[PDB]
Design a protein around this ligand. Structure first.
Ligand SMILES: NC(=O)c1ccc[n+]([C@@H]2O[C@H](COP(=O)([O-])OP(=O)(O)OC[C@H]3O[C@@H](n4cnc5c(N)ncnc54)[C@H](O)[C@@H]3O)[C@@H](O)[C@H]2O)c1
Ligand SMILES: NC(=O)c1ccc[n+]([C@@H]2O[C@H](COP(=O)([O-])OP(=O)(O)OC[C@H]3O[C@@H](n4cnc5c(N)ncnc54)[C@H](O)[C@@H]3O)[C@@H](O)[C@H]2O)c1
Ligand code: NA
Ligand code: NA
Ligand code: NA
Ligand code: NA
Lengths: 484, 483, 483, 483
């Protein structure tokens, strides 16, 4: 019964085609979503381009930031509706949407609004032959129209992570959320409209990737930049697509993240930590650990403790009492994950726990659930230990030596994140620095400070966002050089 | 003269060689060994391995000291570097001697010093448990940097990339333009004699497509590709590195405007536009090929510029009084002439030049053309829109401030712009509205290595210079410690 | 109406009290309780203890949220704050409404936001053993900040100190000017109602010598003394805290010049100098009391300024079209008129003003003077060298740029300068040569809370504003870890 | 041997001289000419004038190259500087050769490089008229910097101030400790031979009160006084410059603690505390004179330290394997020995040392004392609270983490602290709660010139190092352009 419209030039509009939004909990229809055609994408980009020359473009940084705080207020005012939207689309446990996702999304807008108010640029004085000198100063200007394309994992969070700094920097936006999670972004458009954001400043287009809204956005010469979060192969495709236009790009892509547990770790803390890093969001966060290395001396105790804890996870309804894990995002994704589950056994894995789907004997059997899964026994070369699965799974392997484990962690075409567990001062700092990734946590997992640079190396992405890196990426950096 | 590749600390020949030609007289200067795919792979592998050797264990202080030794090595062979740039390119000796070589030395010393003085950030955060966490950032070497450079001011542009790559602790596989391989070869020698470890700096010669340049861009062993050249080449490379999701930096083409307002110092502006139009015979990406002059001073401006253009001395690089050398090559000369023709066919008035000079000596075998000025073309003419990269500019009157801003911005390029006015508000008000990476007011071509440099639209993506180089040529990583 | 001290979460009276008088008409506004040394001790002890309470346990986010609540509390009682400033000082209602109260609110919000967005530094270093070390800096609360503020723009200058002090997690003992105690007392109420913990913010009323002010500077329990006021007071306080080696920040007096070059927009400059000379009745430290005008435009300038000055409306703070209220007090007026006499004895020509207006109503019992303009004095005249702090300026011709730079700088003060010129080079060349902390070009009084602010010579020491406030109000500590 | 003042380009004698004595043997090294108030004035006036000279017109690049020349000049006379430091101070040759002189050289190179690489800020703002405004900051020379330095690590602490002062374009009047005049005089020769313009660097010899030191602080011609020495001297100087409101930087006394937790590497902590207690024979402000050791390892720590301390070779600066030279002077030894007796009277157990060694040669005429270890004193003992500045530490057990932090902080000093622990959380959690400017974890005395350095409480005011030096030794001015 829910209908999700595009939002283009201050108007909610339908489209010729619509597609189904399906609750992964039970397989039921949540909404019809109007798919934007290439003409509507053009309408969005053109509206965005024009909006830069309107009231939005005349706003002082201070007024622009106040307006963005008004966006945040509007989300706050409709808090539980945003909670319901994320949960409906994704099966995410209510407790997590309510305590993490929606507050972080609000925090995205408030933080980048504040960064925009407090930020400044540089002055460089130079001597010249005639001895009267010159000044060089830098300015940040809006880059122009920012195309945003985002994934279904933590959808409102990752979507606003891009939309907030884009708007804070004075840009206008055309944004295409994942076909699998279009609700909260649609709600966000409403908040934009109600908050009085000028027509064309924020445009929402629904659709898929290839031969749809996503691809049409990437091929449009009217955009100044494409920021993207998704699969590595999608990243590469988009990088080719914007190449003729030499568009500014930012890619946050896949990973195969390791957690390392050294002999001097707090073992109970590491078990809890790896449990969370492996299975949070049912293993569907780019920051999850799918490879785990544990020192040989504590390997058996670690594996036994994690098995016990994993089998205590409650897989069930998003608002079921004590639920820890919802379903995967889709039947399609479940079929891929189970295909890896089979592959693991075929590759010689011992299945410590899970390896299948739960049996509910109710509507959830029509959903997309899988069991949290632990493997041992695979060599570092097994596909299941090298390819990103994006499910609730980890393979655990022993190690003996510090340099050895660092090399095995780094032996990967991905390099997003790593978590290290140790109580030793030197070890924490020495080892972290040698890990080839964009983010290392020591003795925790999933702490995010919006001020810090974030991104990956190798196939995990290019560039960094967060803090000044967002303020620089979403801005045109220009040098004005004045001869005195 | 023979120009060898430099790979894993060894000067090596190849299966094929191509000719380096002196553009002053069309003579052979050197044969140049073209690296093949096998040799490019050897260079990339050596670079990868070098990261694990003595280079990778140097303190930032020692690394910078070694980089200062590289610069010292260039200073000590200063005139050999001058001779090499001049021979390859036809660049006036005084310019190579006073600008190019010193700037090249400056690149190394400046980025070495930036590396020593740089630092990163600390963020403290509170947590639920109430014991907090520390987040700090570190700069690490990115890995292997692939450098591909052009023929315009070759040593300068080459070392502009190589210096910060090495300063940030990277290793380098570098492919200089086929037209200008000499100074880069000399640099390899300097690096060798300075005692730079094998594999740290690798020099590979050749072309782009189906040659060393392409092979480098396709190699999965590199961590980044930094490039300066034509926009179409940039696009091609961006596609090539896309599957590996390599870090990229693109400094591409332009069609820069100069704007002279009614309140400009007219004599200063005439001199300014002269230099910006014809320096290096118009073969610098920062050159002005479009000029907008306020209608009230238009005729006087064009008159004065013509006179100054015609006083320009076009000859030998070591000739007394020389202002302009030849174009880089006969092929480039053909292209530029083809444009000289197109302009006329497009309805242009040839205010001066429009052809080639006649010397009646070896220089007629060279690739000289004349400093040229056009008027009377539409904003929509090809000669006013496409990059020519010769000693030419078109001059058009303008009337209003908002008008000229729009006309300057009406371009798929956005590299640089120069503005001439004596008015305080106008200088800042206008500069800020030009859609380019760099605006000069009342001067041309001041460059400070600390400032961010780059273009918008087809003129490129990203910035280098100062902290932008320190951040581009480094892995930026975030380490979060729960306490 | 009675104004109490606010100590350890309680409003308290004292054994002695003093009058708060409306300068518009000499009428009693309130009785103000003077803190004795015992109460100042209580305040400092309470502030030390609050550092160990819930205040000291807040995350930066929660502390900043509380500061925004303080700001919200002022916004909610906006008109009461307006009334308080106007009552105490005679300040025009229009200015209190559009500048002072909003700026005070902005002080809290800006510094709260700076606190949330601020970070510190990480330095990596190599060691012999080759394992290396990390040095990181942290900002921690400095401790108890003593704040002593003046009567010029009282809530603005008070909150300019109190806000970053609280933003950095300090606790505060603050002593506002005895001439303007109301808005600070209102602020205490806002803090109380906002639920700011007891002892975090303490308000003590009184005078300087042998009163609350001196008692604060002499107390060994404070960690810093930040001060805005007369230069001689600054010196006195610098001596007083010397045995404790307390951190200090001084914003002191000035004798600011405005310079009008021949290429200035003449109407703009007349308007600019009119405002810089007579705003707040000449009672801002940023006012111009010396004006230098190029000889070519001197007579026209002076005539234009005379006419505009004579159109200024001097009168009631809420009178329609009012430009100037009274001076702060009869004592200040006695000083200012003494300078009015002195100027004539030194040989001044009185272009306009030079006395007191005649109202034939209650304002005759207030402390009004006329806006006044002098010419004909030498640069050595006392009236041209000593700070008067009234609505007055002397105007003098100059011929040469280097000359006027030297004459502007020839002073024991160095707070601010304003320059009027439409020339691009001149603005930048000249401004850079003026020995002050702040130069404006083609405007006056623009303040951005992100920028450093302060003076040189007798005008102060140190800077506050943006990062300088974040660093002054914090302990900057270095933690160096051997890896 | 004669040590002259250096004023306005000339070495000059004075009316009276004083004796420079070798503390190794009590023998006369040099006659030092004491500058009178008249000569101090000559110095300041010359420094003021050199600001308007060639020095004032150098580009930052040229200034920096000249400072590198100074560093080169020190390098060229390397062993002469070693000899000078050793003769004045009894410092072991090996240490002067490996630490002191190379650090002094590094002070000049690092700050010259910081000068070249530094930049400032641009803030854009909106205005009611809607046209906006630019605010930019500039760093300019502050003016004449007065430098007053101590005898502990003389050349190091002297150049630590002179280098940044010069790198920021100031001129300098510098007064080294009467106990250590030689290396500073040699430095003057280096500046002269490097062709530093006259007046830029001036050297005045003499004492403090009633001598060159006091006269410098009282001269109104200086712009700042930067000081390293005793806390009481600091307070005296802060009072002296107060009427002038001179910029000040104070690096003062300390009573630093080392804390050894039970999870420390015990052998590393023993070697670390041995060095922190006895390096330079206990005569560095960064030395540990209080040590707290967890009770579980107390007896073993104390036994291990006693054994290492009794292995230290006390003797001639070039004696083989020498670890400790003499104290700086007989007067200082008398003070240290008075404390040695006081400790006994206060009830201390003398674990080792407690007197002077017997050499049976000329060293008995010197100023040697033994490395000394006490236990058994209460935290309220004078010997545990007052700075001794000798080769001594008291060692006390502790039980709790919050307890030891409180005992470390229970001091009117707050310069530095060293903590020894292998635990990640503890290192970071404990370090941030120590109320000092500098905490080392698992090392002692690592200094990086980029980091802010200073103390809290009686240990100082302000910070120098890195950007804090570039900002302290510069005028920070804000230029605001209305567009
Ligand atoms: N933005 C700047 O700062 C800047 C500076 C100087 C020159 N330029 C531009 O450079 C152009 C002129 O130089 P150019 O003629 O040498 O440019 P170019 O693109 O033709 O060649 C540049 C380099 O790339 C190589 N190359 C060519 N094809 C390649 C491929 N398919 N794969 C990999 N490498 C390949 C060449 O061998 C050469 O080394 C002009 O457009 C000029 O504006 C820009
Ligand atoms: N905080 C630091 O970084 C640091 C570094 C080294 C030493 N110190 C401290 O230095 C002290 C020891 O050195 P010191 O004995 O040479 O210090 P000191 O205070 O006795 O003398 C230092 C300098 O000040 C001069 N002086 C003395 N009285 C003066 C006066 N009334 N006016 C002007 N100048 C005067 C002296 O001539 C000398 O040049 C110790 O307390 C030590 O802790 C601190
Ligand atoms: Na869905
Ligand atoms: Na050529
Ligand atoms: Na009053
Ligand atoms: Na001596």
């Amino acid at each position: 019964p829910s209908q999700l419209l595009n939002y283009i030039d201050g108007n909610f509009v339908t489209s010729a085609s619509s597609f189904a939004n399906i609750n992964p909990v039970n397989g039921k229809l949540i909404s019809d979503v109007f798919e934007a055609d290439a003409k509507q994408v053009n309408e969005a980009v053109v509206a965005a381009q024009n909006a830069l020359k309107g009231p939005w473009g005349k706003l002082s940084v201070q007024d622009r930031a106040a307006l963005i705080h008004k966006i945040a207020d509007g989300i706050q005012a409709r808090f539980e509706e945003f909670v319901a939207a994320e949960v409906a689309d994704t099966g995410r446990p209510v407790h997590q949407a309510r305590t993490l996702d929606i507050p972080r999304a609000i925090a995205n807008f408030r933080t980048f609004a504040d960064l925009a108010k407090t930020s400044h640029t540089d002055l460089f004085e130079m001597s010249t032959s005639d001895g009267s000198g010159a000044l060089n100063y830098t300015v940040r200007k809006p880059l122009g129209v920012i195309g945003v394309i985002s994934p279904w994992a933590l959808p409102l969070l990752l979507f606003t992570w891009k939309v907030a700094p884009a708007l804070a920097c004075g840009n206008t936006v055309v944004a295409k959320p994942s076909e699998e999670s279009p609700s909260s972004a649609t709600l966000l458009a409403e908040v934009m409209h109600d908050a009085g954001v000028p027509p064309g400043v924020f445009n929402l287009i629904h659709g898929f990737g290839k031969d749809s809204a996503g691809e049409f956005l990437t091929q449009h010469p009217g955009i100044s930049a494409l920021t993207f979060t998704g699969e590595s192969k999608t990243g590469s495709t988009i990088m080719k697509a914007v190449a003729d236009g030499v568009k500014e790009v930012s890619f946050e892509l896949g990973g195969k993240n390791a957690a390392v547990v050294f002999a001097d770790a707090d073992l109970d803390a590491a078990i809890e930590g790896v449990l969370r890093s492996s299975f949070t969001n049912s293993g569907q966060v780019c920051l999850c650990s799918e490879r785990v290395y544990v020192h040989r001396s504590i390997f058996d105790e670690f594996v036994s403790g994690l098995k016990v804890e994993a089998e205590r996870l409650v897989v069930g309804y998003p608002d079921q009492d004590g639920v820890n894990m919802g379903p995967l995002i889709s039947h399609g994704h479940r079929d891929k994950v189970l295909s890896y589950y089979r592959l693991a056994v075929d590759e010689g894995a011992t299945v410590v726990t899970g390896g299948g789907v739960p049996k509910f004997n109710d509507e959830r059997d029509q959903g997309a659930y899988v069991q949290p899964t632990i493997w041992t026994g695979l060599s570092d070369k097994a596909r299941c230990v090298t390819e990103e699965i994006f499910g609730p799974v980890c393979h655990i392997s022993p190690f003996d030596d510090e340099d050895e484990v660092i090399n095995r962690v780094n032996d990967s075409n991905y390099g997003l994140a790593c978590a290290i567990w140790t109580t030793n001062l030197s070890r924490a700092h020495r080892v972290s620095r040698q890990i080839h990734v964009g983010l290392v946590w020591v003795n925790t997992w999933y702490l995010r400070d919006l001020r810090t640079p974030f991104g990956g190396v190798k196939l995990s992405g290019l560039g960094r966002e967060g803090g000044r890196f967002s303020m620089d990426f979403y801005s045109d950096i220009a040098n004005i050089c004045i001869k005195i």
